[PDB]
Design a protein around this ligand. Structure first.
Ligand SMILES: [Co+2]
Length: 557
């Protein structure tokens, strides 16, 4: 017996969702009266009133501080707006790939994912609100624009103030709204179940069970960085697949993520790296707060970069029963990643699409049945099993490949480079640079390489000589939606398969170096040593130090 009250409010101005959802500080969602109410209402207002009663929205998030408060808001507005039902994970917890799974499983209209991914969580941390649609992936620009347009003019939302959802107990809760014939329905479902069931069908859990158990076992440690993938690890890898309990590391989600950044890489996951370095374990992995990113580590802490990782998966992709059954429709990677994937795809006569950074391009090719496996340069791996990237899925793919190959992680890479050659890769980040100078740097570079005779001009370092093949500002004409994306980054492509790429994101400069070696003598060297000639070349032609004052990147990957 709950009522419906419409509350007049003041429209905020900065509620743009972007491709990753509205991300603001927690204290902004709190100190700003009705910040969340307004944006949720704007989301729900994009859904046709003639379809709300029969519609379901999937709701959950990464466990960060303010999540359940926001979930309760979402149900009070969903219900008051005539949305027929919410499907919510127990305690409000659903990883980002879980949300995609459920939306597609139950043909929901979409979902609201309460997460800021890798951004820090806590009272003094971040909060994000993501909106997904009926194919299970991120809402596109056309819906993103409508939302923010509605948000900037918002004059009132509709709420059920007295509505309270019990997120801890499984099953169906129902709410008889004042003056509505149809009840409002909330199913609380187990956070892991539908996602585990999908993974159970994609991989050979029997084969994995054998890998991970017995005194013959693959010793593994999986770092969920105190985020959402915790229970997924414990229920799937430990309980179901019999990995020992110690395998699960930081697999209790905390509202502050333990105080650290839920961001998988060699600095932020240096705990997990310490462990692997002790030489006891064969395989290690870490995830971000919402479960769509992943970092892979070998014994002794051998680091497998994202671009090589999708390449290794691609080259052993038929270790995975899903791909045995569906075939591989194609390979994709964002433009700034290394070309290791390309080499695998060139040897199989399966297509490679090089897209700009961002999910919409992958999702388009996936929905057109042309894309099976993909990566993003920021520790993203995915497949068309869902319409988000999926870190734990990537871990299970590696474990599958380990089980069939029966080699160490490092030995697998060494063989992969012996066969396809090595794409030494690194990414230099220059953070908080004077946006004025950086833009001058980019424009002066773009004009330099748009000169007539800029192609052909050689460059030398340690007698090593690079000749420029192509140079442009990358553009991509999307084969599905007709979109055209321009200014996606400056590319210096060399006749030996090496590349230098600059992007902007004050400002931040991202410098990607991809140097390719076929020689086995050069295959197993320090990347920073092998990349130094092209790094010097990049800094010279861009004159980055001169345009920014930076003698050094802020961060190296
Ligand atoms: Co994420």
């Amino acid at each position: 017996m709950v009522k419906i009250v419409t509350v007049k409010t003041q429209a905020y101005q900065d509620q743009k969702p972007g491709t990753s959802g509205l991300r603001k500080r927690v204290k902004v969602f709190q100190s700003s009266a009705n910040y969340a109410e307004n944006f949720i209402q704007s989301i729900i207002s994009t859904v046709e009133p003639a379809q709300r009663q029969e519609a379901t929205l999937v709701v959950g998030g990464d466990g960060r501080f303010y999540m359940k408060e926001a979930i309760q808001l979402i149900a009070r507005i969903a219900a008051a707006n005539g949305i027929g039902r919410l499907v919510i994970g127990q305690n409000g917890i659903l990883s980002t790939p879980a949300v995609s799974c459920i939306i597609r499983k139950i043909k929901a209209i979409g979902g609201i994912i309460l997460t800021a991914s890798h951004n820090p969580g806590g009272p003094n941390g971040d909060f994000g609100i993501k909106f997904n649609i009926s194919n299970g992936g991120p809402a596109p620009e056309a819906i993103t624009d409508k939302i923010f347009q509605i948000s900037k003019t918002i004059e009132e939302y509709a709420v059920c103030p007295d509505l309270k959802v019990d997120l801890g107990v499984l099953g169906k809760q129902q709410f008889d709204l004042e003056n509505k014939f149809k009840p409002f329905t909330v199913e609380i479902v187990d956070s892991v179940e539908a996602y585990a069931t999908m993974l159970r069908s994609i991989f050979d859990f029997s084969a994995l069970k054998e890998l991970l158990s017995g005194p013959n076992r693959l010793k593994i440690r999986i770092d969920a960085m105190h985020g959402v993938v915790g229970p997924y690890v414990k229920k799937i890898l430990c309980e179901e697949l019999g990995a020992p309990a110690n395998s699960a590391v930081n697999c209790v989600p905390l509202e502050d993520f333990g105080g650290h950044h839920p961001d998988p890489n060699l600095t932020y996951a240096a705990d997990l790296v310490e462990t692997m370095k002790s030489g006891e374990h064969d395989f290690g992995a870490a995830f971000d707060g919402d479960g769509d990113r992943n970092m892979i580590l070998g014994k002794h802490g051998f680091f497998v970069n994202p671009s090589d990782s999708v390449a290794v998966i691609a080259a052993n992709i038929f270790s995975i029963p899903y791909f045995q059954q569906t075939g591989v429709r194609g390979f994709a990677r964002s433009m700034p990643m290394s070309g290791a994937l390309d080499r695998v795809a060139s040897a199989t006569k399966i297509a490679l699409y090089e897209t700009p950074t961002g999910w919409k391009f992958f999702g388009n090719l996936m929905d057109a049945s042309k894309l099976s496996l993909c990566g993003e340069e920021s520790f993203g791996t995915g497949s068309d099993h869902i319409r988000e990237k999926d870190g734990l899925w990537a871990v299970l793919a590696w474990l599958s490949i380990l089980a069939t190959r029966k080699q160490s992680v490092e030995d697998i890479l060494k063989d992969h480079w012996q066969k396809y050659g090595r794409n030494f890769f690194t990414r230099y980040d220059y953070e908080e640079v004077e946006a004025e100078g950086a833009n001058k740097m980019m424009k002066d570079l773009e004009a330099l390489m748009f000169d007539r005779s800029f192609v052909g001009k050689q460059f030398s370092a340690n007698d090593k000589v690079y000749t420029v093949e192509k140079a442009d500002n990358f553009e991509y004409s999307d084969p599905v939606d007709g979109s055209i994306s321009r200014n996606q980054g400056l590319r210096l492509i060399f006749t030996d398969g090496s590349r230098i790429v600059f992007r902007l994101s004050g400002a931040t400069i991202r410098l990607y170096i991809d140097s390719y070696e076929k020689d086995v003598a050069k295959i197993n060297q320090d990347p920073q040593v092998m990349l130094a000639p092209l790094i010097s070349i990049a800094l010279k032609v861009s004159q980055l130090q001169e345009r920014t004052g930076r003698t050094a990147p802020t961060v190296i990957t």
